[PDB]
Amino acid sequence: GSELTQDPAVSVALGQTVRITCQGDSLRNYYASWYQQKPRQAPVLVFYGKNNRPSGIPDRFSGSSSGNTASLTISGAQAEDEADYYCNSRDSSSNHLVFGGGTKLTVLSQ
Amino acid sequence: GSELTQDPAVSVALGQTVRITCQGDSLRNYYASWYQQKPRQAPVLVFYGKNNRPSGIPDRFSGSSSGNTASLTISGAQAEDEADYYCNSRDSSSNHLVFGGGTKLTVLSQ
Amino acid sequence: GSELTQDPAVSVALGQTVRITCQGDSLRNYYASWYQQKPRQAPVLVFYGKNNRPSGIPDRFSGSSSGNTASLTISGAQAEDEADYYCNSRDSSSNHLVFGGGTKLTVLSQ
Amino acid sequence: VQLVQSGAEVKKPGSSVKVSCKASGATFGSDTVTWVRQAPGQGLEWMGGIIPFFGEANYAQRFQGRVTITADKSTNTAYMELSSLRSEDTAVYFCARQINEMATFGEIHYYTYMDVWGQGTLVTVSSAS
Amino acid sequence: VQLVQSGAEVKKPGSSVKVSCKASGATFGSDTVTWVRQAPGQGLEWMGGIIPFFGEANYAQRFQGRVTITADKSTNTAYMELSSLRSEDTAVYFCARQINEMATFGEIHYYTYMDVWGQGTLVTVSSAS
Amino acid sequence: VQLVQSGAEVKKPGSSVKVSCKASGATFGSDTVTWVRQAPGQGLEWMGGIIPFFGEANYAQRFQGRVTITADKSTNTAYMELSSLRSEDTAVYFCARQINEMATFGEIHYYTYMDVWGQGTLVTVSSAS
Amino acid sequence: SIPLGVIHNSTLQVSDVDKLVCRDKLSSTNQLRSVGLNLEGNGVATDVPSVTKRWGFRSGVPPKVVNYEAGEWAENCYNLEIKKPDGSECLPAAPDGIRGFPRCRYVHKVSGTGPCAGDFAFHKEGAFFLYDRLASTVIYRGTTFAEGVVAFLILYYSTTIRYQATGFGTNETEYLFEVDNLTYVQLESRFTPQFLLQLNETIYASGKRSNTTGKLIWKVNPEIDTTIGEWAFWE
Amino acid sequence: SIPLGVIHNSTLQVSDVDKLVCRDKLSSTNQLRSVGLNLEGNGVATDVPSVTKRWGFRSGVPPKVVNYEAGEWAENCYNLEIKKPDGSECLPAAPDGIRGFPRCRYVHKVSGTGPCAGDFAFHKEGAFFLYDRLASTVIYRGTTFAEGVVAFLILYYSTTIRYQATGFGTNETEYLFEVDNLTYVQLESRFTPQFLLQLNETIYASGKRSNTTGKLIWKVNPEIDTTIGEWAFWE
Amino acid sequence: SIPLGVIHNSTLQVSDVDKLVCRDKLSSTNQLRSVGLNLEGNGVATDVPSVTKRWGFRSGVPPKVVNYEAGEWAENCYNLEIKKPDGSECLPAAPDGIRGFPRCRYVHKVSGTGPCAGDFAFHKEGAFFLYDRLASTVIYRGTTFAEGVVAFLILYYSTTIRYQATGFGTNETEYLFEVDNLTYVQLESRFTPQFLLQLNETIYASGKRSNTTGKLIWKVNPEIDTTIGEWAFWE
Amino acid sequence: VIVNAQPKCNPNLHYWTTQAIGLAWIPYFGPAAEGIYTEGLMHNQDGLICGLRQLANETTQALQLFLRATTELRTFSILNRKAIDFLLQRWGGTCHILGPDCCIEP
Amino acid sequence: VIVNAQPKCNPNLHYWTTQAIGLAWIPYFGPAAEGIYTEGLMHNQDGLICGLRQLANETTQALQLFLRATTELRTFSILNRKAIDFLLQRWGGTCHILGPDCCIEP
Amino acid sequence: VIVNAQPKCNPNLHYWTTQAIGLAWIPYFGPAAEGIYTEGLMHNQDGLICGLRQLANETTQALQLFLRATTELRTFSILNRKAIDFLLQRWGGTCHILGPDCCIEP
Ligand SMILES: *[C@@H]1O[C@H](CO)[C@@H](O[C@@H]2O[C@H](CO)[C@@H](O[C@@H]3O[C@H](CO[C@H]4O[C@H](CO)[C@@H](O)[C@H](O)[C@@H]4O)[C@@H](O)[C@H](O[C@H]4O[C@H](CO)[C@@H](O)[C@H](O)[C@@H]4O)[C@@H]3O)[C@H](O)[C@H]2NC(C)=O)[C@H](O)[C@H]1NC(C)=O
Ligand SMILES: *[C@@H]1O[C@H](CO)[C@@H](O[C@@H]2O[C@H](CO)[C@@H](O[C@@H]3O[C@H](CO[C@H]4O[C@H](CO)[C@@H](O)[C@H](O)[C@@H]4O)[C@@H](O)[C@H](O[C@H]4O[C@H](CO)[C@@H](O)[C@H](O)[C@@H]4O)[C@@H]3O)[C@H](O)[C@H]2NC(C)=O)[C@H](O)[C@H]1NC(C)=O
Ligand SMILES: *[C@@H]1O[C@H](CO)[C@@H](O[C@@H]2O[C@H](CO)[C@@H](O[C@@H]3O[C@H](CO[C@H]4O[C@H](CO)[C@@H](O)[C@H](O)[C@@H]4O)[C@@H](O)[C@H](O[C@H]4O[C@H](CO)[C@@H](O)[C@H](O)[C@@H]4O)[C@@H]3O)[C@H](O)[C@H]2NC(C)=O)[C@H](O)[C@H]1NC(C)=O
Ligand SMILES: *[C@@H]1O[C@H](CO)[C@@H](O)[C@H](O)[C@H]1NC(C)=O
Ligand SMILES: *[C@@H]1O[C@H](CO)[C@@H](O)[C@H](O)[C@H]1NC(C)=O
Ligand SMILES: *[C@@H]1O[C@H](CO)[C@@H](O)[C@H](O)[C@H]1NC(C)=O
Ligand SMILES: *[C@@H]1O[C@H](CO)[C@@H](O)[C@H](O)[C@H]1NC(C)=O
Ligand SMILES: *[C@@H]1O[C@H](CO)[C@@H](O)[C@H](O)[C@H]1NC(C)=O
Ligand SMILES: *[C@@H]1O[C@H](CO)[C@@H](O)[C@H](O)[C@H]1NC(C)=O
Ligand SMILES: *[C@@H]1O[C@H](CO)[C@@H](O)[C@H](O)[C@H]1NC(C)=O
Ligand SMILES: *[C@@H]1O[C@H](CO)[C@@H](O)[C@H](O)[C@H]1NC(C)=O
């Protein structure tokens, strides 16, 4: 399966909106799922499909896609949102699960 | 199968009757078939069984048998009747088709 | 099978009663059969079970048992009763037919 | 009922003998056919026996591996085969009909007996001329 | 009814030849297909034949082990295969339809005849150039 | 729904490890059980997965021939076996429930996601004492 | 819709349903009978090469049977054993309860092969195959049957003739008559059972039989002793 | 020609056909019944060695069955498994729909071999074998049956006794009763089911059973406790 | 005790037995009919995961059948092929004479495995399985049937939908719908045949099918186009 | 009323059927199947046999359609059905003594 | 009219037959075959049981000959045939009110 | 008299049954089993279809108990039994013209 591409690190001022992107072939005709990973914890599903999220996720997290690019928007990023974030899709030509490299989101709380 | 015996050559004056004989074991309880063979041609059935001939054969050709001897009579032999003639029967003790040696009938037309 | 024991020889005055014994494990819960063997003859059944005999045996022959001991009583022994006598039972733990050693009964007729 | 045995069989050591016994007046049914041995000067040894109804055989320990006992119900005969004959085997071999009987009236009793005996077959084993 | 044979087959000694014969105007049915040999200057030798109804074959003794005769009823053809050709085998091979006939009217008579002949196949065996 | 994984497994290179995962609150049904690998300082690698309904397995190319994934529906557990462990395989291995989902209302959309994650199993490979 | 005939005054009258006639007196069910009649009694051809033309194979249609209480004696009946060219059986085994027709003067037993395209062999005219007190829409393998029809009303030795055939299920069917295991004659539609038996005796008496391991087939000369002017079995 | 009895005033009168009596009132088919009765109720012998004498083998005759609506409870019924000496089965497998007779006090199960010359075992007196609501002219293998007759009219635990036999199909048939797998007694016609069960308890209690791998057969002494004066099942 | 309805003046009146009414006129047996009706006409659920709940396995009870003269067309009918986990067959082969129901709009064919504990699958409500003019108490393997009841009175293309299942005989039964040989969707009770066929077309048109040798299973989002207010087949 | 329209007609009907002494009735002692048949000969009195052959020729179509319509593999019920219809036609519904319909005399 | 001529007769008839509540009627919940039977006991009132045993003894010959004559392997039709003959004897043909033959009163 | 008590009722009965020209009647030329069916549509005139569905719902219990009680594997006799009982109820036993019991008019 063709790999997804992500920029390794993003910094956001506390209280500001940040955009985390993902690119690749597995995004051309599908939607990416996004996960939040806290240190020493399993990835937590944040957003998926075209328009929704599981309960427990605050209304700061939403997203969209176009072409072969997908993104997660975190509005009013909180100190509590510092996390690694990952995009995930499926490459149907090989039927392989594909993760992007993720990104480290740094919230500039200090 | 026991072989049939024929005299290798017979000459007949044009317009005269000729008798062609055949002898053997296969004639004791059966009738011989007679064939006319023209140069470079397949043998043609002339007379068979006890009393008949196929159509196309002129009423010059007829025959009979007794004991272990069979014969073909050609009455009023024509120049056109010059041919090799053969007798044929079956030796039922071996179930073999048996031909005699044939005879060359020469019609003395010149 | 455990063997039956008999005393090899018994002498009885003519006209007197004689007791022939047999001992062993095969007699503990069963009855012995007794046989009379004349010289150069097959053994003849004399007495069996607890209380009876086959016909042909005179009323001189009767018997009983107790514990692991069995006996044949010959009352008024006759000269004609000189014979080897044998006891027979079955050892059910091995299912073997067991004979005692027999005894020679001598009738003192002379 | 009678049992008829074969006549004397005289052979040299190492040979084998097959001793027949024929029933007369009765079939074997479900009765036991037993063979015993009378050596000269001796008592009676059990050799073994069969039950023709089932075809099973049992042997005295001293003859296990040496003696085979069989029967044929179409003729009501039985046969005892001895292998590896030795001079100590000279004896009269007897065929008998064995009844295992249970008394069910009143007191319960068990006993066995041989009711019918054959005349005996003398088998002699000797290297002598 | 006609029989059509293959054209000339010229080969060197040691080769084999397969000579075909096709029926036209009729199927073989239960009639006998027989082959005979016309060597130059000679009379007519029987080689062998078959009955397509059953698939059986019979051969003249001089060709036993040398000649195979078969047929295919889906095409109404027959084939004669000769092995180990020698120069003495140069001949015209003829295909014919053989009728074994019984006369049942009045007197009883038996005879055989070949009713339909093919044109003949020339088979030449020679080492010559 | 929860997934419970086994505790840490520490072994020397050349050894093999079998990592279990137990479902709680649900059976596996027809959902996909997938395993991923979190090496220290790294992102998430797909290793492979199964569909218990059919018993089939698929693997990421780098682990083909090294990893076997199976399951037992009577216990609703799954197991991942790694052969020929090397020090580069030190990682936390995660068990997750994967849903391939189609949106059929209005516009048609396709996506996949992992809904249920286990806590992760740390597997350490090292020759060190 | 099945008609029921009534016999009175030696006259056969079919009883109507629309018109109720009080005169018919059915006192018991013993007066009701199913009787099987043969087609040979109507003058149809009975000779093997002429009658197999009336039978044929089809698929997609199941078999059915009905019973009889009585029936006609047959002059002719048949017994078939037909295989496909690859050895597979053409006709089904008869089910339990089927036995051959009880009284035949001649049995024409045919062994052979052919293009048995369907599942079952059915009668082309709608007639039934007759077995021991059972009429059937299909032919069962190896069991002797008569060919016929059934009416509903309100009131020993035999000779076996053996034949062989190829191409049984098509128009180009070849037939032979057996004389001996290795001796055959060609069969023609002009040869009645009496002719064929006389022909068999003639061959054994003359001795013109195979005396080897292979088979011999004789043709019969077209001139035969045609003494019978197409007489019926009953003249 | 089958008689039909009519019960009125607790009296059984066979209804004639020649004389029509308007008095018989058949209002519905629920008044018509087929009832099976056992032969044991007529006093026939029931003991195995005495009843197998009434059965025997024949070929060339097919089996037939009829149904029942009701029947008698049996004191005795039988279950046979007979083989030829070469291991081939004597009796046919029962067809679908046949089950053993529903209510028996004792089942006499006989395992054995013999000269089973025919195709089927038939009753020699014309009586029928009774299965679960079916009367049959033949015996089926392995299925429990009662022996009896059927009349037509207008209106739980059991003990299994096992036996073995040889020469089953002839007059010289030998029978044994099983006590244990290796323990047998000879069977005689004088031994009722109660006697035999008491005999079985006596042997286990006394301990005189085979304690090896071979079989033991006991004979029963001719003197037995003959307390019953040939009483019927019902006294 | 079986009721017989009589239709007069377009009114269905059950005919009593205790009260004899001379008005019912049965002139011929052609006025008597057995008609099969489907349960779907009473509004029962027809969807596979909802109807297999009405069927189940039992042992010790034999099957029975009755015939029909006429019946209802089915919107839905079923065809099962269920095996035990070890490969053994669960359902019996149909006997000769059984054919699938003659007219169905949709056939729900289910292939799968499960704990088939009994001998036969019986209807839990007492309803019958309907075959070609035969009602049966049990399900036969591989043969299409409708589910229904029978009344007694005095007077084309179809679509096959394939499914798979595991744990067929228990409450935790999982079901899949086949799109392609390697492509499946999860099945839910909310998905009608029309929904499922639209779902199948959508997948082929979008191309989201397995393009390898392994299988793919899709889940359907809980939000679906719920345009139908639990309408009956007939609205 | 039936007139034979066949090419030929055989006027002599030689027939067989199955319509007891001592032990003969018992299957163990009685005849084997080939021997359970009896026989006789009927003559064409007043054309009766030829009329009968023609009846069987007309009956066949109705019977084949009948069988096509059923599921029974072996139909033994045809004559019982006829007995029932025969009698229902006269006595089903109601009898009216004053009409032409009921087979009853006053 | 029937008088028992057997060696012995058992005068007590202990019988079984098959002649429903809640779900019991449904085969999935109802009794297995061994349990579908009911029972009762009849006494020999006025000699009825012994007369019946004798009837069955006479019936057997007629029945065996009947079965010999058929081709049905399983005959379930005997009582329906009897119902038909019973009724045909009285109402087949014609009824005549003035005669001794028809089971009708004026 | 029958009133439908089911959750829903389909008032349109689309039915099939099996109720001939030239050679069509001959099985060799006629239709294969899938094609031997005819059809039609009945409307719920005066509630007749819904009443009928309810009758079938009541009939099932009596029928299952009936089948439990027999040994026939394939029962084809139910309607013939009904015809016999129908007619016996009116004409079995005796007819009395002066009573309310016999379906006869003077
Ligand atoms: C009840 O009684 C009537 C009257 O006897 C019978 O009627 C017969 O019906 C069959 C079928 O319809 C007829 O058969 C057909 O006859 C055509 C005419 O043939 C004439 O010429 C031949 C020459 O060889 C003569 O043998 C023959 O007797 C006639 O004089 C044929 O052309 C037909 O063949 C074609 O169709 C059939 C399928 O139908 C194919 O299988 C053939 O290969 C071919 O394509 C066919 O043979 C028969 O002629 C009618 N008989 C009479 C006397 O008229 C009923 O059959 C009978 N019912 C029952 C159940 O017995
Ligand atoms: C309806 O009711 C009647 C009256 O009860 C029954 O009649 C029985 O019929 C059978 C068969 O005909 C009779 O059986 C034969 O009895 C002959 C006489 O035997 C006497 O002696 C023996 C001694 O052991 C007693 O057991 C017996 O009871 C008699 O006192 C025997 O000689 C016959 O055997 C020979 O023929 C048969 C074949 O028939 C062979 O198999 C034998 O090997 C042998 O060669 C035979 O046993 C019986 O006696 C009659 N009973 C009475 C009381 O008279 C009907 O059978 C019954 N019908 C039905 C269907 O149940
Ligand atoms: C003739 O017509 C009548 C009337 O329509 C039918 O009556 C039905 O009979 C069945 C069987 O007795 C009834 O089924 C039972 O219903 C109980 C109640 O369920 C309600 O809630 C569920 C929720 O999912 C609804 O789907 C349902 O419609 C009801 O509203 C259930 O609790 C029962 O289940 C338990 O018992 C069964 C065994 O009986 C087990 O298999 C189950 O696992 C569980 O333990 C059961 O489902 C049905 O409700 C009645 N229908 C109506 C409308 O009342 C007759 O069946 C019909 N006869 C024929 C032959 O068709
Ligand atoms: C043919 O003749 C032989 C010898 O006489 C004879 O045995 C055979 O039965 C005859 N064939 C037929 C069909 O009668
Ligand atoms: C009849 O035989 C010819 C032979 O050429 C064949 O083409 C034709 O198809 C056959 N017809 C039938 C009906 O079998
Ligand atoms: C068959 O052939 C042998 C020689 O092999 C001969 O003796 C015998 O007479 C022949 N029989 C006939 C009937 O020709
Ligand atoms: C014989 O006795 C044993 C031991 O008490 C018992 O188990 C067995 O059932 C008895 N046999 C019979 C036929 O009752
Ligand atoms: C009865 O037994 C004897 C034993 O010698 C035998 O010859 C006879 O044939 C047997 N009889 C029957 C009818 O089996
Ligand atoms: C069987 O034999 C063993 C010794 O092998 C003995 O201990 C046991 O008590 C015996 N049992 C009986 C019932 O005799
Ligand atoms: C699913 O779509 C394919 C492609 O159009 C079609 O062939 C197939 O029949 C469809 N499935 C069903 C159940 O109609
Ligand atoms: C229903 O499913 C549960 C799952 O825990 C199981 O324990 C129970 O036995 C099942 N019930 C039935 C009736 O199958």
Numbering used by the authors:
A (entry chain J), B (entry chain L), C (entry chain K): 1 to 110
D (entry chain H), E (entry chain I), F (entry chain G): 2 to 130
G (entry chain C), H (entry chain B), I (entry chain A): 32 to 186, 213 to 292
J (entry chain F), K (entry chain E), L (entry chain D): 503 to 521, 526 to 612
From the publication, what sentences describe this entry?
To determine the structural basis of neutralization and synergy behind glycan cap antibody-based enhancement of base-region-binding antibodies, we solved eight structures of glycan cap antibodies in complex with mucin deleted (ΔMuc) EBOV GP (Makona) and BDBV GPΔMuc. All glycan cap antibodies make contacts exclusively within GP1 and are heavily biased toward heavy-chain (HC) contacts. Antibody contacts are focused on the β17 strand of GP1 from residues 268–280, with the majority of contacts centered around W275, which, when mutated to alanine, abrogates binding. Through molecular mimicry, the CDRH3 or CDRH2 loops of each of the neutralizing glycan cap antibodies characterized in this study bury analogous hydrophobic residues in the cradle, displacing the anchor.
Additionally, most glycan cap antibodies make some contact with the inner head domain. These contacts are characterized by hydrogen bonding along the length of β17, with short CDRH2 loops for EBOV-293 and BDBV-43 or extended, long (≥21 amino acids) CDRH3 loops for EBOV-437, BDBV-289, EBOV-442, and EBOV-296, very similar to EBOV-548. The structure of the unliganded BDBV-289 Fab is very similar to BDBV-289 Fab bound to EBOV GPΔMuc, with a root-mean-square deviation (RMSD) of 1.6 Å for the Fv portions of the HC and light chain (LC). There is a slight shift of the CDRL3 to accommodate the α2-β17 loop in the glycan cap and a larger shift of CDRH3. In the GP-bound structure, the CDRH3 loop moves toward GP by an average distance of ~3.3 Å. Our structures of EBOV-548 Fab and BDBV-289 Fab bound to GP indicate that, although binding abrogates attachment of the MLD anchor, the β17-β18 loop most likely remains tethered to the base of the IFL via W291GP1 to N512GP2. However, glycan cap binding may remove some restraint on the β17-β18 loop, allowing increased binding by GP base-directed antibodies. Conversely, EBOV-293, EBOV-289, BDBV-329, and BDBV-43 only partially contact this pocket and also exhibit lower or no trimer instability.
